[PDB]
Amino acid sequence: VVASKASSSMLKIDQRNKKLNNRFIRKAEMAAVEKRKLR
Amino acid sequence: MNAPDRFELFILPDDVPKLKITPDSRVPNCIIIKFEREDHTLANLLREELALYPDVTFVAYKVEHPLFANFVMRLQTEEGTRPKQALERACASIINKLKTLDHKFNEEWNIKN
């Protein structure tokens, strides 16, 4: 393929952002559901 | 297709005067001035300078349509003074104010640099 440097950088950014989203959004949702449950 | 040329906002045609003055005979000592290729930048400045003069009893302006670059001013003064003289005094006063403002700005910029 010989990918460009900008495209490879964007792919790395996308992988990091996907991992960070999958952690943080899930943790926030768990905190929200436990708070709604304890009420 | 029907869009006017953008330079028509500020370029004055050869047959179109920059300034046309007609009297307003309804009240004494009043004139109507028509400014061509001008907008709020000059109009508001002149109006609010003239409104502080003791011998100016009426001053106003209006831009009839935003698609045409012109405005019309109405000016009424006391019996002793003529409205054109008041307009000239206002122009000279704003020029002097801008001159001292520029001087002080240059002084302060040189001080702080």
Partner: protein, 42 residues
């Protein structure tokens, strides 16, 4: 076990769209046609 969050549901939906796509019904119907229907009609 552990509870299932909304993010897990979106993971399952992502798996669905990774496998099927958005025009899978058209392609599957045409493939069924070409593979068997012409022979059966003949």
């Amino acid at each position: 076990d552990d509870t299932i969050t909304t993010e897990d549901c979106w993971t399952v939906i992502s798996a669905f769209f990774e496998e099927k796509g958005l025009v899978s019904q058209q392609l599957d119907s045409f493939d069924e046609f070409m593979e068997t229907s012409i022979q059966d009609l003949v």
